């Protein structure tokens, strides 16, 4: 189980991969049975391919907007901003990903909180 | 009813407002009667307004959002904020992210406050 410090490291690593757009590298960070709920409120996405599909569908710039809050039970929450093009126009989306990592430092749970209210032009 | 995404932003912002002024009673009122609080997440959950009240009475300090509340459409939201306390002799700052799920009456059903000493600044 990653330590509070390792969680900070992994979560930041995740943002870096989304930012560069390395789907393969992003997918590899997920445990086998990892689930993704993005946005939180919608059906969880399960499986390597579906997740890769989800990220390819999505990937865009992403960067932390605050430090990773990490716990001692391999979990963490981080605030970030996604820069993308929507309705043919440059937009921003504020998100908070809550993640639970496993013993191998792989992502078991990803929950991204955000909705239209967090959408900005 | 279950707060819309906009209502969640409003409710969560209010929660920080209450912590900031130290209104224990009004904080407790925001919680469902049988709410669960995990603060810091990773520690045993505390249950019910009595324990939540004892918890906040023990803890309550200033707090403020450091970014917008991220809200969902299922009455949930997460918010980043900083807590300032003159704890440990000197003033310190604790960066936290609270994740809340509200119930059908617009009260807090659960709250998880993510943070560790790793988020404690001086």
UniProtKB/Swiss-Prot annotation, chain B:
GO biological process: steroid metabolic process
Disulphide bond pairs: none
One Pfam family cited in the UniProt record for this chain: SnoaL_2
Record InterPro entries: Ketosteroid_isomerase (IPR039256), NTF2-like_dom_sf (IPR032710), SnoaL-like (IPR037401)
EC number(s) per entry: 5.3.3.1
Reactions catalysed, as given in the entry: a 3-oxo-Delta(5)-steroid = a 3-oxo-Delta(4)-steroid
Result of changing residue 122 to A: Slightly reduces activity and reduces protein stability
Outcome of swapping residue 56 to S: Reduces activity 100-fold
Class of enzymatic activity (EC top level): isomerase
Active site: 15 (proton donor), 39 (proton acceptor)
Induction comment: By steroids.
GO molecular function, one term: steroid Delta-isomerase activity
Entry keyword set: Isomerase, Lipid metabolism, Steroid metabolism
SUPFAM superfamilies, per the entry: NTF2-like (SSF54427)
Entry keyword Repressor: no
Signal peptide as annotated in the record: none
Keyword Disulfide bond: no
Binding site for substrate: 98
Effect of residue 120 to A: Slightly reduces activity and reduces protein stability
Subunit organization: Homodimer.
Protein name: Steroid Delta-isomerase
Organism: Pseudomonas putida (Arthrobacter siderocapsulatus)
């Amino acid at each position: 189980l990653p330590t509070a410090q390792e969680v900070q490291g992994l979560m930041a690593r995740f943002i870096e991969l989304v930012d560069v757009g390395d789907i393969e590298a992003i997918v590899q960070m997920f445990a086998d049975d990892a689930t993704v709920e993005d946005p939180f409120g919608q059906p969880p996405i399960h499986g390597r391919e579906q997740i890769a599909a989800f990220y390819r569908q999505g990937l865009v710039r992403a960067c932390l907007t605050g430090p990773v809050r990490a716990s001692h039970n391999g979990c963490g929450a981080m605030p970030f901003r996604v820069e993308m093009v929507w309705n043919g126009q440059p937009c921003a989306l504020d998100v908070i990903d809550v993640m639970r990592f496993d013993e191998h430092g792989r992502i078991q749970t990803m929950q991204a909180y955000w909705s239209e209210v967090n959408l900005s032009v």
